[PDB]
Design a protein around this ligand. Sequence first.
Ligand code: GLA
Ligand code: GLA
Ligand code: GLA
Lengths: 503, 503, 503, 503
Amino acid sequence: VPSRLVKNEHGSWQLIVNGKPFIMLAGELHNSSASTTEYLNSLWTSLKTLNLNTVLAPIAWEQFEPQEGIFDYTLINNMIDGARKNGFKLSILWFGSWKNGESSYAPTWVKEDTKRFFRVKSVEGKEIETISPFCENAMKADAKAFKTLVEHIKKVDQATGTVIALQPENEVGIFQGMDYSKASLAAYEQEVPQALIQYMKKNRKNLRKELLSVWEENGARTSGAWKTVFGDNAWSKSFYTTWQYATYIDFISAGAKEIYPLPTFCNCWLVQKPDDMPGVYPNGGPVSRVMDIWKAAAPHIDVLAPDIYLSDFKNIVADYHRADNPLLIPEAVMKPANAFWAFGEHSALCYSPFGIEDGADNFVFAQSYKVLNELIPLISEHQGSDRMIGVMKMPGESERTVTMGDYQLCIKYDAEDAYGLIIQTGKNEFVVAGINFKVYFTSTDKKKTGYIKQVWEGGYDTDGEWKATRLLNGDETYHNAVLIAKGRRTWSPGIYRVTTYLR
Amino acid sequence: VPSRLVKNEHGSWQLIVNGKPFIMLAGELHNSSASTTEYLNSLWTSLKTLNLNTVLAPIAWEQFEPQEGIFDYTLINNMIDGARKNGFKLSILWFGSWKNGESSYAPTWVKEDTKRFFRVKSVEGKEIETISPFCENAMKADAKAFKTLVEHIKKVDQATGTVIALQPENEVGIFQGMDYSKASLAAYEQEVPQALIQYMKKNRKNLRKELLSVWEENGARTSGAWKTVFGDNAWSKSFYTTWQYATYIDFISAGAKEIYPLPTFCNCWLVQKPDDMPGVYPNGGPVSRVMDIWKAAAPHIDVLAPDIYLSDFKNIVADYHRADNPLLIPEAVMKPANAFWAFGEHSALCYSPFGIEDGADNFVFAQSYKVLNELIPLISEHQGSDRMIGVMKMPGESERTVTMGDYQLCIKYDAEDAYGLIIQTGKNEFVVAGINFKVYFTSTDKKKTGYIKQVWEGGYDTDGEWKATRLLNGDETYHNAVLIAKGRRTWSPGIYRVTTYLR
Amino acid sequence: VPSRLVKNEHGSWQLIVNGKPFIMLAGELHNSSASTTEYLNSLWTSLKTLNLNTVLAPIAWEQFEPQEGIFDYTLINNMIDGARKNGFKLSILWFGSWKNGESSYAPTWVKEDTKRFFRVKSVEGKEIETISPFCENAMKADAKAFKTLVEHIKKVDQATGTVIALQPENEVGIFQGMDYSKASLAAYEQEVPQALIQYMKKNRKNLRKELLSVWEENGARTSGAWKTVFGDNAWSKSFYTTWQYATYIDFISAGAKEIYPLPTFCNCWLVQKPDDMPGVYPNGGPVSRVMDIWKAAAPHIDVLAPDIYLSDFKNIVADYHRADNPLLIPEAVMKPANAFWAFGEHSALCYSPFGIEDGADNFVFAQSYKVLNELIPLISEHQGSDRMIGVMKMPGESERTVTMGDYQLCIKYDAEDAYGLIIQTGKNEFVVAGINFKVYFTSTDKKKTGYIKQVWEGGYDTDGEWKATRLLNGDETYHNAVLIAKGRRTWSPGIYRVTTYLR
Amino acid sequence: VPSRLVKNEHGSWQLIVNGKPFIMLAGELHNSSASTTEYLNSLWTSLKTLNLNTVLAPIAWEQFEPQEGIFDYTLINNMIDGARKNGFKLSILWFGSWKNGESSYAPTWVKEDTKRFFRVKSVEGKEIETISPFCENAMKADAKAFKTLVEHIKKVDQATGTVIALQPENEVGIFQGMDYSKASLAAYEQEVPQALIQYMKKNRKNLRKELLSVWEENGARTSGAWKTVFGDNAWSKSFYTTWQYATYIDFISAGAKEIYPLPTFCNCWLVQKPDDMPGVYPNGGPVSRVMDIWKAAAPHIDVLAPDIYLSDFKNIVADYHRADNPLLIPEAVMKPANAFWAFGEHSALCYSPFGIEDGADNFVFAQSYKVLNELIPLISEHQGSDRMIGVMKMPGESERTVTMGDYQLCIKYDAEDAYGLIIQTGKNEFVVAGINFKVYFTSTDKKKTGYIKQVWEGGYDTDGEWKATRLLNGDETYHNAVLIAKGRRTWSPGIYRVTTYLR
Ligand SMILES: OC[C@H]1O[C@H](O)[C@H](O)[C@@H](O)[C@H]1O
Ligand SMILES: OC[C@H]1O[C@H](O)[C@H](O)[C@@H](O)[C@H]1O
Ligand SMILES: OC[C@H]1O[C@H](O)[C@H](O)[C@@H](O)[C@H]1O
């Protein structure tokens, strides 16, 4: 396969694409932007102006299998063609059974057969425009379509590897405490799957407090029905609903994994505010609260991926990033700081603003992606090490101090919009990227005096070779008292090589 | 003849031009803009930028017959030539005896002979710059000139049919309770024409309340002088004045109809405010109040056409549009909403902003006319059916609900300027055109649940074939909860094909 | 001579240039703009953009005769050359003895010999930077230089006639009650010249009140010294000072007139405010107060020309324009209204903004001059007749009514900046030029009704032929109720041909 | 040598470059702008737009001798090459031991050997990032590197003379009362060098009051230790610290002077406010207070050069300019007035805004340098004479009166930004350059009347020949009452030739 997840020596998961470490400097199209060849093809030049290396774009079941057993390859073919012609990799979003909780992208022939493909019912007993995750017929039909899609991708792309990941479904779940379908009501009475129980036993001290605290308040049982093991409440309802979604979607993924295994992720509509109960967000989706349930149920899903539109960026990405869950953000705001934070602080695989085609001639964002592209080798090499950090000022913060081997770095912000990353490349050498901040280097050991030795500004050329544009000194470094990450001027992030010394 | 009015199966009158249904996406030039070949010819490129299919332009008697019996074809010839070269049809306005009530376009040789062509007198006894409608000499001279014009048009245009309609005179009437000319005073004493009496008898329950109520308050007589049948008052004065105008102008039209019958309309200066008595507007013109008198008197005039500059657009067009009177608006404001309302709600033949050459690079208006042009076949096919409506928000309105077969449509406005039209093309299919509104589809029958199935955005190509630009779903339809008529973006009206379904 | 003043049948003086009536649509350069060939030549294209037919430009004595008896033809030659190449006539300003009262343009060899060329003395006894008009040596030297200049112009221009007028000196006089030079003090005691006395006798009832009232308060004597005939006061001082200037400058002109007689004018710095006594303005200059003295003394000076920078334009031009003194304005503001007023109301020979090279791309002024150029034949033909008037609104005015044969014209202003002219070309025909006003035509005789018959907008082509651009009617003339002088649109003055009629 | 300092007949020092008087119309690059060939080469076209004749640019020791005994000629070679190709001379700044007091440009191999190259110690005993001026090893290493640099310049530039001056080090000194290094503490106890004593004896009445007053308050001794001759205080500390710096740097210069003597200057960080004690500015630098110490100690340094960023420009330049110290300003603000003041009032050798590459398309500054370039021959010829002055209005000033031979000049300012210069070129002739001021010429002798005779505006062509663009008179000189230095218009300084006369 031309795309694979591989753990490095620091325990960090890396994307390896066509034999090399690859980070998705990505963007996701608006939902309807890949619905015709002509509309998509109008976008490619726009996208290139932003220095993307990867485009996230949907394939809709309703278009792909417009009558049962009849498959239309037009949109996937043109999508791969245009990606190749314009220098992009693709992550394919499968808008099948569910997108933002609902079934609006299911085929006309699925929608119209509510007997074969039964719907979620509300507490009021109303069938909604959502296929129930307890419907096995729907599971099989989606799975067959998805597999056919992936089979096709292998048949047209197994050598080039334009397609480097897959997202089955999109932000699944129900805006309800539970599905009131008869099948759902019967499932709630069943025994808790052993696979869940054993997962909880084996990984107890690393479990989500939201799961552990509910398990333990019911006596941490190793058998029983859902209401026995987890009590009769909103959480028990959320847990078995989540188990169902992860299980349905795991089967869908399994079918693809058997014929052409690519990195696979499912994305979640986040718990928007901290008191929100399941169903105010999509109940069943892979929010961090239920991460353990998804891991237990869905081993053919590699990553649980947050869609982040909220301002509390650093806390959110820290919440989703775990040893068993690399950070992968398929939908976000068009804010360069976020990118630098995700890649530098958390070794992310992907950063991707949503509706990216809208953001053409966001010059600063484009130049940010240019600089990140220059740094992909260096970032890759340091994923998971304590020698790489991000930099991102949040309102009300003024400085960040960190230890890097022999040195203490004091990062002070010169403007509200201040961001970058810092890599220690040698005992007395650092690469600093970004804008609107300063770095003071001092000695960890107080018997010694540490100082900047020399500073160069520059970039990496197309061969990956460092080229200095200036040796910064005098005013430009306050006579080596400080690194000023002023940025590249046309202002956008710069790259600075700093040597230090101890006397 | 290459232009004709024909009633379809729904009882709606259609313009059939060169064998096909035609709707005038029109504009009228400023009054003096066709007075030389050079000034007119300077306008054509401007007009094309607005996507007109039809130009309304005057021929002035004073220029056409500058000495009695001598005819100058220069302006009509160049007008037809330029229309052909720039892809426009023409409706010819005949500024003869009267324009905005007055006789300023009559030839020098008519103006200067007030014995042969006697004037209206005021109550003070003053002769004004208006030829009296009781002057038979003036009737004959105008009629002869008009016929000569039309004879010429046949001789140069009978095959191509560049000229598709005729407007004899322009907003006729007097700013007076009545003409005080001796002939006028003698006419007021005469017997009411039987043709009027019989019209009133035959069409009593469909008569204008303004006419019926006056007739019935005088005892609904079937014989007598004007003051007998209608009482001695302002209304009796207006009625016999109107009879005179319609009769004079009918004779003028009759002469043309005999040699080359084209759709013929007379236009009115509207009753500007509801209390206004005859003479505050031109007394004698085809305002809706006297529509029955004009129909009775002038069978060679096909349509009575309002000139609408007032904001109460929907009430006005509803007032002029009758089973015997299609809506045809030769003069209006340059407001796209009005166009969509007139064509969609009332199956109008014509919408035409006045001084159109001024409005070049009114981009939104131009794109509106582009979209209407795309829809002419579909609009044509649905003229007079209960499956086509207009959409136009007025201040203080928030929604419009309508029944369309099995579905209830709730139209909600997203901005003040919200307009379009809606056609049901199938039991479960709709075409929605416009901007700044949303449509919710639900089931008429409350035992059933109705929903959007699929939504496409697109347009009709030059062959008249539908071409989708996107399948709208997800954010673009709130996951098929609603049709968002956002418009085509460059914002101007869009076209959306919606399929629905019942479960 | 290729330029001459000739009185027409209405008593009006006309400029006849190369055999045809010519009106100077003129501009005067800044003072130093003709001081090198290179600076002047940089201006010609600018000037052409303003549609000038005539440029007023200086020749400075100091440059022309830089050593006594040595003459430098460079600047006059290049000036005539560039005028020819760019389609302009020239009026030559001779900055000799005096410019704005002073002698700053006299040659270095005149300035430095205050014995040979004695100065004006102040009352304090100080010699100033002004050559005394009582210095005969200075008179002769200036006269010889001026004649040499004109001799040269004949020698290079007698056939083409690029040079069409001459201005000897520039705004002469002293900022003093009188010259206190010994020669001046001796002149004040002399007998009043008979030529003055006889002029006063012969033209008594047409004399300036300022002169007559002083003469008559001293007993209207026919002999005596200045203080006898005019009393011992400021006026007597001004009169004999003025006599001296006019006499000195007449001799200068006489020398030129003998070899090559061209229209010759002297220009005055105006009495700036009504109480100002001689010497607050240049005492001796041809202000209107002393017009009779200049006429008496200086028969080789054809015209006394006001330099008008003040806002009271209509009163000023009425004050300078007399039967023996055509209106000629060599220096004015760049205001088109002023031009139309001067040419239309007062049949002026010249209108000329000062520092004209500054005003390039004053579009409105340029288009004004274009329209005047079109009208020169028609204006010429009506100079001095009661069938041509100007139009110019001043603050606080609202209308102007005039009688033109059978018609009464009511001119009503539609904006503050409203101006043009009106010519009756036939008993029932008028040409109206301008902008921002309206004209109502009614019958002089109240037994008759007068009205507009027809209105055309247009212009005169390069052959001088009228070409209509539109027949204005309907909205454009309120149905012949009024002429609307809206202007040519791109707004600037238009030309309108109006026919009228009486019934 | 192709560049040399030579005293003219007025006692003024002139730069003679390639055989001719040369004034540096200069600019200094930002500190890091000559750190790569590519960054420098990006600037040349920018610099040419400003009409510089000279660029000041650094060579950094750390780059030039990156390992001991290994020399890298890349940056000096490319610098000379680009200067030649773009028409500039160079003054080379040697950023060696010290730049703005500190040692940030010393080689890595100097910084890292604090035993061989010992640092300054603070009063707290801390070694700082400054090489001590008492370190002989550092003196020798710097001197050897500097000499190698100059040897190279001779080897590549001895014929062309692109390099016309040298600045060893940059704003030297310590932010301390004294160096607390053991060597520094031992030096403070030593005998005052005789060379200082004798200098003070010989030049007593011309000594800086700051030095003389301290010497005399300690009894004006001719022998003793520093604390004996100058007391035990801050001044004694500053004096021996300054002696040390001047001595160290003199040795560095001496090595170069032996093989290739060019004009050499050292620049100072100014006493920023009048109460500031040594160490608030760099203690040891050539501020004016210690000018005598630098002259005594450092005969191989030709000029002590102020870096002026403060608004008190006229007082500062008067303070640094002495008979033994021409004015040379290598760092200043980009303000044209300053340039005119320095060159005109004080016959400066150099005016140079800092960060000049930033100021491209400062049009006014560029045109100022154009005009100065035109005047270099005339300025050169009048350096040190009482016939050349500067003109520069400071806030709160309104006029300046000066005597120039027979004439009194009253300079009155017409705007805040008013500046230029004035040269008397003959008994009755003046050249006035500048903008926004006026000059009134009157007679020194009150028995005589002095006046402007004639005024020309113009410039010097590429051959150095005067070319008048206009003879200014009339309005342009108020009829020779005044010279108006209005400027060249596109507004920037003009050049005006004025002749005057006495009667
Ligand atoms: O723009 C809203 C956004 O909401 C979620 O993040 C979905 O995953 C996206 O497809 C889109 O609907
Ligand atoms: O612009 C005013 C307008 O008034 C009426 O509608 C007329 O029919 C038009 O010709 C025009 O006069
Ligand atoms: O601009 C002022 C103006 O004043 C007078 O009118 C002069 O005749 C002109 O030459 C000029 O000096």
